[PDB]
């Protein structure tokens, strides 16, 4: 295929493809979950070529946040907030906990990141 940089609205329409993709990746990697990576407005964070990712279900939210913090090389004083499908889980939860809470007919997980929480 080809790389693209567009919002979820693109894959929000082909429900048949979104399901097929979720179904194939669920069977290919059931110990992992497909995650959408998107930056929210008002943020002050660098961009990286990451749109669609796959993470293990057993990864603790605090650890996951740390890996991405180090990935974006933010200052230690730099604020950072993550939102999984409009919700804010505790850092003691795991990717499998939020994946269960977000279980959909498409089987995709949406994750947003920002410097400040501003709709």
């Amino acid at each position: 295929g080809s790389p693209e940089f567009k919002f979820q609205y693109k894959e929000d329409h082909p429900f048949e493809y979104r399901k097929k993709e979720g179904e194939k990746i669920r069977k290919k990697y059931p110990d992992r979950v497909p995650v959408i990576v998107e930056k929210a407005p008002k943020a002050r964070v660098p961009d990286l070529d990451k749109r669609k990712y796959l993470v293990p279900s057993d990864l603790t939210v605090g650890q996951f946040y740390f890996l991405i913090r180090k990935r974006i090389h933010l200052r230690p004083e730099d604020a950072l907030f993550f939102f999984v499908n409009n919700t804010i889980p505790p850092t003691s939860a795991t990717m499998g906990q939020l994946y269960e809470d977000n279980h959909e007919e498409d089987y995709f997980l949406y994750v947003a990141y920002s410097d400040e929480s501003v709709y």
Binding site: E16, K24, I25, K28, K50, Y53, L54, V55, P56
Partner: peptide, 18 residues
């Protein structure tokens, strides 16, 4: 449609041997 791939679908996995 009906997909007929061989290679897995495009998704960046982040899972090293560690």
């Amino acid at each position: 449609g009906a997909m007929g791939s061989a290679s897995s679908e495009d998704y960046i996995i982040i899972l090293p041997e560690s």
